[PDB]
Design an enzyme around this catalytic site. Structure first.
Site, mmCIF file in Angstrom:
data_model
loop_
_atom_site.group_PDB
_atom_site.id
_atom_site.type_symbol
_atom_site.label_atom_id
_atom_site.label_comp_id
_atom_site.label_asym_id
_atom_site.label_seq_id
_atom_site.Cartn_x
_atom_site.Cartn_y
_atom_site.Cartn_z
ATOM 1 N N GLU A 84 -0.226 -6.515 4.927
ATOM 2 C CA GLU A 84 1.319 -5.714 4.824
ATOM 3 C C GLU A 84 2.369 -6.716 5.450
ATOM 4 O O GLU A 84 2.100 -7.954 5.740
ATOM 5 C CB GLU A 84 1.279 -4.902 6.041
ATOM 6 C CG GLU A 84 0.211 -3.540 6.144
ATOM 7 C CD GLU A 84 0.137 -2.667 6.821
ATOM 8 O OE1 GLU A 84 1.225 -1.834 7.110
ATOM 9 O OE2 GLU A 84 -0.893 -2.572 7.612
ATOM 10 N N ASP A 103 -6.954 -1.300 1.758
ATOM 11 C CA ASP A 103 -5.983 -1.817 3.144
ATOM 12 C C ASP A 103 -5.562 -3.237 2.491
ATOM 13 O O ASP A 103 -6.485 -3.900 1.822
ATOM 14 C CB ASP A 103 -7.097 -2.245 4.401
ATOM 15 C CG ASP A 103 -7.252 -1.077 4.987
ATOM 16 O OD1 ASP A 103 -6.511 0.087 4.921
ATOM 17 O OD2 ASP A 103 -8.321 -1.068 5.753
ATOM 18 N N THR A 104 -4.423 -3.275 2.371
ATOM 19 C CA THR A 104 -3.694 -4.556 1.794
ATOM 20 C C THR A 104 -3.144 -5.264 2.935
ATOM 21 O O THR A 104 -2.717 -4.395 3.892
ATOM 22 C CB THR A 104 -2.443 -4.310 0.835
ATOM 23 O OG1 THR A 104 -1.662 -3.359 1.497
ATOM 24 C CG2 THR A 104 -3.072 -3.216 -0.434
ATOM 25 N N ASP A 162 0.843 -1.267 -0.085
ATOM 26 C CA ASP A 162 -0.077 -0.064 -0.023
ATOM 27 C C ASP A 162 0.881 1.361 0.146
ATOM 28 O O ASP A 162 0.250 2.305 0.139
ATOM 29 C CB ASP A 162 -0.879 -0.135 1.442
ATOM 30 C CG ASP A 162 0.029 -0.093 2.513
ATOM 31 O OD1 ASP A 162 1.127 -0.228 2.530
ATOM 32 O OD2 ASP A 162 -0.868 -0.185 3.547
ATOM 33 N N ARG A 178 2.405 11.125 4.701
ATOM 34 C CA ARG A 178 2.556 10.578 3.333
ATOM 35 C C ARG A 178 1.329 11.030 2.563
ATOM 36 O O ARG A 178 0.178 11.548 2.938
ATOM 37 C CB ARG A 178 1.914 8.810 3.520
ATOM 38 C CG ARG A 178 2.991 8.190 4.646
ATOM 39 C CD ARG A 178 2.790 6.732 4.834
ATOM 40 N NE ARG A 178 1.512 6.717 5.551
ATOM 41 C CZ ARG A 178 0.935 5.453 5.727
ATOM 42 N NH1 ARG A 178 1.582 4.277 5.227
ATOM 43 N NH2 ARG A 178 -0.069 5.382 6.334
ATOM 44 N N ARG A 191 0.818 6.877 0.115
ATOM 45 C CA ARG A 191 -0.024 5.971 0.693
ATOM 46 C C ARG A 191 -1.486 5.485 -0.164
ATOM 47 O O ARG A 191 -2.104 6.720 -0.467
ATOM 48 C CB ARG A 191 -0.821 6.118 2.224
ATOM 49 C CG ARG A 191 -1.902 5.298 2.735
ATOM 50 C CD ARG A 191 -1.424 3.874 2.847
ATOM 51 N NE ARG A 191 -2.125 3.026 3.805
ATOM 52 C CZ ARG A 191 -3.448 2.201 3.395
ATOM 53 N NH1 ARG A 191 -3.626 2.332 2.035
ATOM 54 N NH2 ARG A 191 -3.971 1.577 4.419
#
Length: 136
Positions: free
Chosen positions: A38, A35-36, A16, A82, A30
């Site tokens: 991680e 939402d991946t 992400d 970010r 970001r």
């Protein structure tokens, strides 16, 4: 209306997050709305499908001819500094690609940074229905 601006890849950090040169300066971005799993999860470290989502993003950006960033209508940076944007590789949104492949879920949304919410939600439903990756 939203508009796309050019950027140059510096380095892919995780499923992400990517570091890019944006208007002559290096910045970490970001990916908005997703939402991946991680690999640099703050509590867990490497989660299941983490390495896969990470490789997917990296490949997509490293192989592109042109990268473009598109900010939404609300805040453009998070609390960690970010940039918050939709990232495009040769006209394909990386955010949607991850969701379409079952390598990310649509995140908790914060208006007004929700422009492509419906689009992403449709892709997630299709991925669930196909039982891809995270949904298998």
């Amino acid at each position: 209306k939203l508009h796309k601006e050019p950027a140059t890849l510096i380095k892919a950090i995780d499923g992400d997050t990517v570091k890019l040169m944006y208007k002559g300066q290096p910045m970490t971005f970001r990916l908005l709305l997703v939402d991946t799993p991680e690999t640099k999860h703050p509590k867990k470290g490497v989660e299941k499908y983490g390495p896969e989502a990470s490789a997917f993003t990296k490949k997509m950006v490293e192989n592109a001819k042109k990268i473009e960033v598109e900010f939404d209508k609300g805040q453009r940076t998070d609390k960690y500094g970010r940039g918050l944007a939709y990232i495009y590789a040769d006209g394909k949104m990386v955010n949607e690609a991850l969701v379409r492949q079952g390598l990310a879920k649509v995140a908790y949304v914060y208006k007004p940074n929700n422009t492509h919410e419906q689009h992403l939600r449709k892709s997630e439903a299709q991925a669930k229905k196909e039982k891809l990756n995270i949904w298998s």
